[PDB]
Design a protein around this ligand. Sequence first.
Ligand SMILES: [Mg+2]
Lengths: 346, 346
Amino acid sequence: MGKSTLKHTRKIQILIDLPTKDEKKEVMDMMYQWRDRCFRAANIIVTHLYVQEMIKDFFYLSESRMNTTYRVVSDRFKGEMPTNILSTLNHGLISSFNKNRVQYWKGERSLPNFKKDMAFPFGLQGISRLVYDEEKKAFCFRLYRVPFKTYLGKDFTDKRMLLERLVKGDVKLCASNIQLNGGKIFWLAVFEIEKEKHSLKPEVIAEASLSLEYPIVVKTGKNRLTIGTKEEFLYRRLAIQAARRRTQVGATYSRSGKGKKRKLKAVDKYHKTESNYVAHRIHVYSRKLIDFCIKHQAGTLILMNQEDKVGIAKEEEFVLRNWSYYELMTKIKYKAEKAGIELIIG
Amino acid sequence: MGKSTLKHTRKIQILIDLPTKDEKKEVMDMMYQWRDRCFRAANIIVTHLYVQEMIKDFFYLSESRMNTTYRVVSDRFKGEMPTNILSTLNHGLISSFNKNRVQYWKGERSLPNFKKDMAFPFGLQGISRLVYDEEKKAFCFRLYRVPFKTYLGKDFTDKRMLLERLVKGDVKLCASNIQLNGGKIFWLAVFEIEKEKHSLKPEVIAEASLSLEYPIVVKTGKNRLTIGTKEEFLYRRLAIQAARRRTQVGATYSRSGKGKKRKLKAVDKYHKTESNYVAHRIHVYSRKLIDFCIKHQAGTLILMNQEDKVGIAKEEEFVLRNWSYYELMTKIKYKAEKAGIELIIG
RNA sequence: GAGGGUGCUUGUACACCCAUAGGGUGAGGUUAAGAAUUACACUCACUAAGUGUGAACAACACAUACAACUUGUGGGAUAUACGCUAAC
Ligand SMILES: [Mg+2]
């Protein structure tokens, strides 16, 4: 079933917030050792859990589920590797194996050997002091008593204000991972955002137009969305017309005397299919327009129409022509009134 | 004595020799079943081998095999499929894993993942009663007590002599496989064919360069040959790419509600068309290069990969990019090793 | 009219067909609505295609010029192309 909360996966840049470069090098090598031990532990856990699962087929093997494996790996790596990271890795791998057990038994998928370059996971008990510093103009935190800062760069994307509510507590932080790539340290962070009931805000405006290059163009707030293309909308129509043309040409050069209905029923069918295709196109474009209005909570929509240059002359042609091409005004009004959107014709 | 033979893979189409279509469909269904069971068995083989290796590593750090893997795949798939396929699959996977054991423990490689669309193996013990039939104009042979006839058609020179060599026993067959594709059965045979003897003078050197506005330019002495044209490699491929992009844009409102396979049914054609086209053009160029080497009795050919102005800045580009674009070096190696011509890189 | 079928596999063209094939469906899954029912770049699968004989959507026979022929496969909305498999 669809969960009441959505999940967003992002990749922010985490950097050592320490003054001395020697401390930075120490933290870097300790992170690298962390990833090495994480790989070794993860491979050992996945193979051991496979052995415990496949006790039937391992007859030739010469001699809850958390405790034995986690403790064995712990005593193997006590003092040289943090314990909560092992706990998070073990929990994640057991979740994955419980998910893919059937596939592994049937033989569809082989056992994925986690390589040395795995993005090593970390739990909630490891991260600390996740607060936004205005003096540094960035987010800062403490991972396992190691200071760290965020270098989001020239990012205008959702990550910044995601972290804003995250430090504001509106978002629960899931089991996230630290990835190392080419000396760059990223935080593969999974945020759980509660799906608030999107209330159609009556005060925010939306403008929809019948452009020349795109059939529907919609503008709402600081976002613009194009709906289809002339080529996409016209490919099937051109195919239908070409089929009609070749059928008529073949019939005109075919054998007569067998009835005119047998000669033109294909042409009539092709005409009907062309009309039905355009109707389906109108339906799907209107559906996407209303859907975009729903997700942006645009409670007010205007069909800004034609009027431009105070009565300008006729151009080449308008894709979807006017608002009354295929009852398009009616279809949009219908889907709006079922959605809960007031409509103002323009 | 050194190896005087080079392994070559051949695709021989095989039709099913039963009178009516009910038996044909039954045997085709059984053959699909064979392929599916082979993929499952191969995956289980790889998982078991990796688990064995990691358990050995675990036991070493804390403080026969072929028979075992063959036995486990047997008892998992006895009676539903022939037995020779599983043994050859076992032996091949064991050879590959014994070769890559160090990398797999270290972690620089990912464990193999076999899918439902693989060729399944069979050894030289599968072919029985291989004889040319005069009434049916085909070679007939029984593979695991299943009759099969060869569909060569207009191949009165190439594969008709290689298989006529097999019945006499002059040419040896290594392990083969079988591919199944859209109602067609293909046999992928690995033949050990001796190298041709040609009059080659090692003193004469034919210079070939991956440069110019042509794909590969070769010359020696005073003769020159340009292998292919830009309009036949880059521009034609750009047409496939542009058609694919148009199809991808047009697939957002293609037939929806039927999964991503059908919504992308038109896109997938151009991914195989472009791959096949480039693999054929590289084949033709790689053959037209070794052809010029053979024609003037060139004993060794030099491949100068760029090396322009001893490390100069990047120009726009020259066709074919580098000397391993689409296995052009990997392909040139075998056409040189068989011919006895030495290959020089630079 | 693109693109496909048949002409051993791959490529170019070629004769005959198919082609709204970016289409027409079916099964499973998720979702909303009081319902009809919508949806699903969710999973999976089916379906058109040479000539003569032949009752037949059985089968058989016939069915082009040029070159290659170390292979199979996964991912790829705007990531520039990456990885798995056999062999030397
Ligand atoms: Mg064909």
